[PDB]
Amino acid sequence: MDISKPVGSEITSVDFGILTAKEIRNLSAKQITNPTVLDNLGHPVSGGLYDLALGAFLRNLCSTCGLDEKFCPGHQGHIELPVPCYNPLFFNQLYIYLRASCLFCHHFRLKSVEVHRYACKLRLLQYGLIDESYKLDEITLDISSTLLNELKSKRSEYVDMAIAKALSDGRTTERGSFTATVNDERKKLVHEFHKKLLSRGKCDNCGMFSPKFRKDGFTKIFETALNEKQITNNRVKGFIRQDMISTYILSTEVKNILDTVFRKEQCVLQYVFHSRPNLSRKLVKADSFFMDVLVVPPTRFRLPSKLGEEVHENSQNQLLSKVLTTSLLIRDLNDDLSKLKVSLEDRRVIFSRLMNAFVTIQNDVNAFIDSTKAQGRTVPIPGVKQALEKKEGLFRKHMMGKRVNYAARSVISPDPNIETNEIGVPPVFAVKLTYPEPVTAYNIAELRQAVINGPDKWPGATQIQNEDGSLVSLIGMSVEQRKALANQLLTPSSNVSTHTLNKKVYRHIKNRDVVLMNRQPTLHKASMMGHKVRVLPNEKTLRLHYANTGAYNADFDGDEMNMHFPQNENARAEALNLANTDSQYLTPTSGSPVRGLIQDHISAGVWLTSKDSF
Amino acid sequence: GVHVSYDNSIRDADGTLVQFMYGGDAIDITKESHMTQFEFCLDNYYALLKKYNPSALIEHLDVESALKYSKKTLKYRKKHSKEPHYKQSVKYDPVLAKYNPAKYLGSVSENFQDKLESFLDKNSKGVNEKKFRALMQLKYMRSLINPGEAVGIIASQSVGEPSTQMTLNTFNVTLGIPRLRE
């Protein structure tokens, strides 16, 4: 973080959605088709995981932005899946909508008036109005279509009026009101809706029975044949069709069933899939649950791990190469299928070849996303779900908590000669921990000395940052160069593009600085206080006063403490006025003191304040 | 996310109200210590009067609105002393519910009001009983929890950190951490 580098734009909100296949194909830097990663000699193979279009790799320049390994941010690519695959994360959902739909009229087997009742209640809940969603159930008039359509009209009329009335006042915005209680009422309904959807056996719209769908642990669906009672039901309801004019099921068949159902039941699904009103007016398509392409992350996030001398292959590239082998194989199977056919009859083999092609690519797709959804291979390679939940997870281990710069660790040693608000910093830490101090007229004298002193003499400086943004290390330089740079610190900027800026000096930690002292476990905020730095010569341990022993719950029995050196004035002010030791005399648990003298001082006081003491 | 809002109420990260006032009085625990130590405050009247400098505050606050209301609530409270909680008067609600504690001198918790008035009656002692009342009213004003204070983390830390001291076994009912877990 640089104060000389302000940011004018900011992220106000994050929107969660699904990438469309058409969207990925346009943004893609290169289509990945080759399972090999390197050509002979050592250059990356064209159409492979290490292609230079995905970013700079092996001292070569990127073939998209032209930059080298340092400045190139990396670029996304794509794998064209020869057949659509079920997205592992959304399989359970597409399964619910597959079991809930009629295979004839291609509507949900639940009565349209009941479905509309859920769509109405879910639309009113997009806006913060729960009372109105319950008041909809009060709207009431084997039932005729002319009567049921009037009920749908009266319900829609109340929904449109209740929204407009609340919209007129400050009850709900155009973007819709959303609270935890509103969310509770939404979650309850979306659950009840799917429960009613799955419960119906015989379709309420057209009285014909649909064949039940079963599932296994892996992403694969089967179709159980109808019983003789239900087969005869299809026959007797077969004539009314004319007047209007276990077996494995392929991914394409499921997508085609859901395609029509998501079109015919678009009204309810519009509110089932949108927490707040859909202002973008996007269509809720079934192909969101399916994957026709796979995005190839940039080479930057798929670099081969180097441990000493051995250079190990990246686990993601391995899983991606597997998807590429299967894709080339199905392209050949489809090419042979295209050749031949007059001769057929035994079509049990062509479907058997198809089932294998589909289940193999699906498994390779699953293995890449979530490994615990892929078949056992004679510990497997972790999927992207496993990467986000390795141990505590990416969110807990690398977002909520992080390893930090400008910080030190050491065994604490007692010291009654330092202030109760101070920390004894060893000179080892003082010559390494630096603060970016901007050079000005009021501190030119102080920083000139630090620059002359250099990175090994305290109080010195390890580096100097010019107004152009560049850094000048003082580490290798002798007293002569340092003296010259010090007389060049307050020189006016020739460049008009940086006249606003002034040089910075990365000066050693002085005795006026704030530091954050931490003793783990940090069970309460008093275990992380702000201490005043006191550099003590010829020291190899962090010196701490006895008054701090209580708050940190630290005993000098070989305990360790973390020292954090905040790098800006806002962070300084906070460690000196809010998290500072003196402002932590009383704990917020009971409002009682956690600061005081511990042993020798108590025995000394009883003797010093005694009547006999003159 | 739970913290103190600028409207003195305890609000969650998403603006949803959790409490209308911190502990029903808006007092910072790290301040509520000598707030009942009336004899101490009396012996150090001029020292604390110089601490809680009122000369730079008298133009920013109200000195009567809350004080008048405090008497009206005390009137109806004394009327239904022997009466049970369900039969108690609901005419006038507490002075803290109607007047901002940081803007009105006298909008104090009824617990503090009862304790302060009881001290002035049971102890007849150059400090007047009326000028001491103002100092304690002002002390309460200066003991308010700051808007922005993360009362949520502080609460969980105040329940967590001392629950480490009850890891030891019994020396019938469930105790310590297992009961706290229940």
């Binding site: 141990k391 505590e392 908590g401 660790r409 783990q520 476990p521 070989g558 360790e560 | 877990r181």
Partner: peptide, 28 residues
């Protein structure tokens, strides 16, 4: 045992691998 805890910079709060894991072994 305490010589190892002395150097380890904690990821989070202790861990529920005790009685808590068997109490969490119950669905809604």
């Amino acid at each position: 045992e305490q010589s190892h805890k002395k150097t380890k910079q904690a990821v989070s709060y202790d861990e529920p691998d005790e009685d808590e894991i068997e109490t969490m072994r119950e669905a809604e």
